Subunit: 505 residues, 4 copies
Amino acid sequence: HPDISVDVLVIGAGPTGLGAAKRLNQIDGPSWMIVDSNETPGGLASTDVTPEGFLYDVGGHVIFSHYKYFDDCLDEALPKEDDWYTHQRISYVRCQGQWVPYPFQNNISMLPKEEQVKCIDGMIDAALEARVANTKPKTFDEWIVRMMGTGIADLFMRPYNFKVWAVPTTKMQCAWLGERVAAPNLKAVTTNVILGKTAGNWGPNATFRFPARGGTGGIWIAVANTLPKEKTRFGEKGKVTKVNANNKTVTLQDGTTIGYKKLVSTMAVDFLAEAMNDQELVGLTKQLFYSSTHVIGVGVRGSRPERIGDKCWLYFPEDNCPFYRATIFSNYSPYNQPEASAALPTMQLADGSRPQSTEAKEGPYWSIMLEVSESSMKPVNQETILADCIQGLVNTEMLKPTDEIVSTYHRRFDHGYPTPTLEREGTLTQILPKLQDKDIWSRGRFGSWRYEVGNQDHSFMLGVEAVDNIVNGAVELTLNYPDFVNGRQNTERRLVDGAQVFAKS
Amino acid sequence: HPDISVDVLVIGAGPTGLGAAKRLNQIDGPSWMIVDSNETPGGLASTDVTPEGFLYDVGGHVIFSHYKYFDDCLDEALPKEDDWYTHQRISYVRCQGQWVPYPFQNNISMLPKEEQVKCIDGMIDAALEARVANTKPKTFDEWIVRMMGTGIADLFMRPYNFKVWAVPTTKMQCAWLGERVAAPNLKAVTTNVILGKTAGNWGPNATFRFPARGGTGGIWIAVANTLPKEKTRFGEKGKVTKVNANNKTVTLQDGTTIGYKKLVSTMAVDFLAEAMNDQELVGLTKQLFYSSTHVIGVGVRGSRPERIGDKCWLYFPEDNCPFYRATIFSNYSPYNQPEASAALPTMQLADGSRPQSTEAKEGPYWSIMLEVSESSMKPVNQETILADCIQGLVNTEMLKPTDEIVSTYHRRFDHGYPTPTLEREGTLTQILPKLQDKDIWSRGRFGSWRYEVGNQDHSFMLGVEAVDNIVNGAVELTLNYPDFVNGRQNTERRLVDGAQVFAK
Amino acid sequence: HPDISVDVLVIGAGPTGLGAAKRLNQIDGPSWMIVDSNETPGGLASTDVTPEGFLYDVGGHVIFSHYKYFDDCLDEALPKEDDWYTHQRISYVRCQGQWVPYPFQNNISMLPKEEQVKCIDGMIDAALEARVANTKPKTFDEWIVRMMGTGIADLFMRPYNFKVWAVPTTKMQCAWLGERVAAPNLKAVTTNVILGKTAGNWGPNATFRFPARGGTGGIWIAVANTLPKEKTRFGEKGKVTKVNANNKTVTLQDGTTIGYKKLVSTMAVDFLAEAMNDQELVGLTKQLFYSSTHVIGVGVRGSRPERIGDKCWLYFPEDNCPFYRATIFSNYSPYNQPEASAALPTMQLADGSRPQSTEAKEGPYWSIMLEVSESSMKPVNQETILADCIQGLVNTEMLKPTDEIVSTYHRRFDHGYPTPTLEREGTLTQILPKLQDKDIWSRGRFGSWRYEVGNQDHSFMLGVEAVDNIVNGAVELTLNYPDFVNGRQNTERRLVDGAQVFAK
Amino acid sequence: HPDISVDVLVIGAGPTGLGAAKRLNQIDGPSWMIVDSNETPGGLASTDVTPEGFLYDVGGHVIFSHYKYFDDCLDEALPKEDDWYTHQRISYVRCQGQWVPYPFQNNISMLPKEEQVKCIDGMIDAALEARVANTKPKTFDEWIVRMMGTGIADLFMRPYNFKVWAVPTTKMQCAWLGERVAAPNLKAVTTNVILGKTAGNWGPNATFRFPARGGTGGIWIAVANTLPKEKTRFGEKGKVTKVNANNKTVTLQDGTTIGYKKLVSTMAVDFLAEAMNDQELVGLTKQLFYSSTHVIGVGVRGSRPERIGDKCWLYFPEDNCPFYRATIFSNYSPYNQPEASAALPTMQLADGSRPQSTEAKEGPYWSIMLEVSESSMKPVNQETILADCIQGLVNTEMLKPTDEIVSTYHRRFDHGYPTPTLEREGTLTQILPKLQDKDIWSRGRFGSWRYEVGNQDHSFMLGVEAVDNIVNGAVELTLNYPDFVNGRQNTERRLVDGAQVFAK
């Protein structure tokens, strides 16, 4: 008999595990327990802070919720109106010395005329081909070129996606992008070129909310806090080392054994296979491809520069900088960096030179967060990446050579992005049924390895739906039908359902 | 304070209400109650019997299940292997003196060659057009011509569908038919013509199961039997006469009042509106269109004729008979008609004449079930419809003039088919949400009026999913995404879920 | 026995008839003569002069030669270098206050950005439709929209062409436009829009040459001058009044009879039918359609305005003026109007006011030539059309209100354009072969009624090829295959062929 | 000064040179002479005879005339109705043991069903592709697959054309096939399949006429006989050995020199270049591809076998025989072989064995004429080809092993077909204008090297038109616009034109 026994054991307390736990706790039927090897819940949705007081998420983290249930839990966790800040979804593509409003194709009036001609000519070819198309695109690359035409694809989506995924667009699938037909909106694009007009895809109703304090990681701490503490086990005490799927027993690092009837595993599925000592699953899961993420944070002295303005996130297809995306994290919340009266010495100037004075001075401060990808196809020199990113900041005109840097941050995350390669589904449809046959619901960004349902809200719901499948026979819609859950507002499932209402009387 | 109070009240004990009841009874959380004006549950999935012992369902009833939950409840209700008979899904189209295996277009090799030419030419036009199509069809008719071409459409789907829906194909939407692109499989059609082959869409894996006894109605009586009797109110005592949506109170015919928190109503939504005395809802529901169904049953003396054989259901596009579909109901089960030893006099010959003898004679017996549609666009002479059907049976060579008829059945069901008119959705998206905001889940063949999810399994699951939405925040998938539930095996929800397992 | 007998009689001495005559004269085999009711040859390619000394062609006449034969004869007729002026083919469309270089679609960068959007959107639609099109356009209108899209069609080709043809574009065929597929060059149009480029279809190698003196009429007088006079009969003496096709006899105004073996008739075919007293043919020819042309000329005091510059011809789609086309005729030759030292009083200002001073002042002078169409579907008030045109010149900013007009000209030509109606070919198929069988070669702008081969060179060659068919069994290529002759440099036939070289 | 001088010198008295001569003789203007290395006029349109009396053309020669002028000259040459025989254009494709009527695709009902399925499926692919095609095919091969689809292309046109051209279909252009859009008539093909119908493209309307005597060679002998003898120089005396283009002098075998103003050369343009000793042209003409033709004749004892019947010519795509085409030459005229009473010994049986008796026996007789192509890409063993052809006849069931062969004929023609390779035009547009600059009209099957205008009627007209260009400035339409001349009835040019009528 094992040290402790529950009906449903949840491994991991990132958004996915927390979702499983939130639904288990709501149902309050079967006994359950959630473990995590980290004392702080949140997983990849956590937040670090430098010794100098600059918070950084694990790269740009921006919530768009497809589910009311997710909204219910965020609201419960952070209920005050000043627990959040609201911003418009402002993004740009850095291209040939310009900040081009997203979406790129609707804004190429900013490029030289000769290049506009090439772009439009390419999209004309794409529109004429789309008119007689009778096949679906088979690769990400085909999808890109059919949507954009060659000239536009070459400027942004092709080089950008390589810098993101660290694999060529020709080696990726495109089903994950959804069911929308790959075809240009030629009229929209030429209309903006003719009018000499720019237009981003944001406005008063295209907004997101960011937590006032603690960064994204604050959300999950708050959510976790709403669970019964005695049913949680976070820290070294909660680190799983072995899973005997046959005995439905899990062994933690401190030797504790847990018996379960159903397992919800949100750890990376390749780590699960190793922990199960299953050679067959180990074999299969090493067929899955992923990239690592280097997050670099740069704290800068001064009020926010006019040139940065209200920008939120930014895309970098060009090769004059190593990052694919930058986030003006200081725009998300004034509490993401020290207040103006806090004193910090300048560490270096943006151009790498030493400051004239070593003395500590006041702010105000602003803050840039950058992401660099790494794969077996795209190596990252960890000893020079910070300095190279900072050089990239000068090259892209985000910093002047003279800008004062008061804080740096660099961290490498081994499992960053699960790759939508051509082979992914072929591999997943062998792995998941084998785990399912053992009453193991492997779910999450790396639990189920599906980027298209790999955001915070998706992950959370993957955990919720896993519990709902386990207990109520619910369809696991997010897991199996990304296009379905993404094409609708999911209003039916709520933090308070009829069940708990009727029970309370 | 009303006479009774329950958390969830279910109106109607046809397949839909029974689904609601079964899910409620499984969850066993909220209190609930199910009422019906009929002593026998089943609704349009019931079975009648003539005084001579011939059973008849409400027209051809053949189950194809999309849901394990449904199978679970059917197995629970009728657990024995001898409770069921298995049959292949054998259907034909009567056309120009021949029985053409379904699907029609794959079997036009049976028609005269000149006609095959016309058919193939039309489908060639449809293929070339589909090659450059970039719009979806907007009407049932357009959908048909794009799938089949003009020649084929005119031979079967066009005239047949008018006989079924009792409204022209140009007046119906086509979304209900699924997301599949409207375009011909030219190669499969020409291949069969070239090889001179016929081929039905059945075989050892395209089967269905039919209850050994009591006809389709027997399923629902047995499913109803698994419910706690004290939670059911069936008969005149359970006939709903008034619904007060404001006070969440229902009043039965015998004056009984029932308070509810949530209402699952499976009666026809136009009847519900009337019971609510809600004049706005009455106006909206009057915008919906439906056809009535005449079910005609004919019991015949003799061993099953070889010309009939293993046929199960049959389609009739042509003018020489008023029915759109016939079912050889005696093939579905030997208990659908009297044993051979049963003595019965001949009532008439199939040509309409009086029999030579009035003496009761033995069988064996076989049995034909026919359906005729009626609507405001397609009236039917009620007084002659039986005799017209019988003459139709002679015209199509299903009966010989000399065949001996020993039993007849005819019943008109006012609400037969909810019609997928062009207008249906615009009207429903006004009705269903308005009812929803009053905490009324109106669901089922006429409860929510969507034929594409209007079979027994769909109906049953509409009831299940309505309860599951009310209690467990489930998505009402069947109701809102026909294409979704119909395109997969719905395996997740079972009669015993983790919930009930952990409970013990 | 008739007064005169020749092998080949040529009726009419405009370009077509003179073509016939030049070929007959070069071959110098069969006997022949040529008649015309006018003393001065040239037909609709003649030139008038006002009492004030301003020349006017019969509307805008610009030669583009598709044939070396035609060149040879023009060079023979006018061999001196200073017999000609050369100009670039500079044309513009007047639109929304702007002179838009031709071709219009390549120059819409001159219009407001909002107009450009509408034009490009329209042309995108046409490009996507052209990608799947598998029929040819049936009407001029279809052809226009397929080529240009709606937005561009509506700004220029549609309204302009109604103003020209005096019938709606929907009533005309489109084969006469040639064999090019009706489809937009979307890339070329969008590229010029993107670059903000304008670009005319002219330059150092897109030129025309114009006669130094006598206007276009000078060419035909001089070509006619190369024929032997005794084979000509021009004036009242040569007016044909009767054609007896069966007796191969023609009667002149003065009673002279001329017998012929072959007849080349270049007068309007409807006139020919009347002269033939052939009611079958009168009936048929009356089915053809044509428009009348009002040629208005305006002589203006002053040096050529900068706003006018080197413009040659100009198109006017808009309804702020009655003319469809203006020509800056004073740009074609300095001898189209008086010398600067010539004194002329001002007849009126462009604003319509007439000054009290009759003082004759000197020049220099410039000149505008205008055309207004008339037909049964578009009447023209002959009494006001001059003043309306002049006000149109003010509306389009060709003239200032204060400009001083020193000469006016207005003449109506009954047969102006032979219209390419939908019915034209059907009707000509009944007419031309009927005449052919009577040994009558009816040819020319109204002789054979085909506008696409109705220019001076085409006409000339229709006459040449008629003779060549009569004498040498040549194919009448220009008559039957406009697309053929228009798509190549016709170099083979020359004023001096091998036959004449060897004969020496 | 040269031994003899003329305005126009014609080299070669095949159809092309004879066409030039006929027109010169008719015009009777410039002086002229025609020479040939062969005492008998006709070139590749001549006829041989075996010692046993069996006539053979240079392969199957069947006249389809596109020109009235050609008809005129043939009718002049052989004016009696009994100078000609008329036959329907009857042809078949030998495929998988069947004689499939031409055109092949309309008759695939004769093939096994599973193969019909493959053919139709391929043509369906081609039809759907043609529906969205926006390019012209670039190779003969692409043109074939677009017309026929893969399956049909593979059975006939692909393998057959390799056997004809002795180069792959992928190495040939396709413009020579005309302007017709490359697309299948899918309905025509499916219809005959569905109906199980076969039908050739012949009937009482589709006929040809063949000379009663002397084979095709007899036409040209008779036409040449209409020329003034004194203006012809045929035989060893007429063999051109040198051409001095600069001096405009030709040198014959016997040393005679002829001066000309204009040269119409109908010899192979590669031999012309050699005779001109022009190294630039010799290099260019060596870039032209051509195949050699082997003609095999087989005379057989017996009345015409039923299996052969009224067949005229036959196509052989398959590898079980070396010939690409066979002609039942004995069907063209009873005078193409000895009369029945003529006695001839049997030379061998079809299976190659000796006859039982070596004595002469009577007919009747019939006759097969066969064509085998040869090129650098496809060698022919000259020593075994006769035997291989005869075996092919047995393999194709044209001869029984027992049939008695009474005559054999074999002859190799080095210049057989001028090949429409991808490069042909690039080369010819360099060669022809250079010759044209030296007043040399190089014209004919190998004179101008264009197969699509390489028949007897085209060749004749190439010469006629060459003269007409030289003397009358006519356009050379046949030479430059094959599609134009082949798409019309050319009725204008006659053996007696107006010119000759007016002269008398």
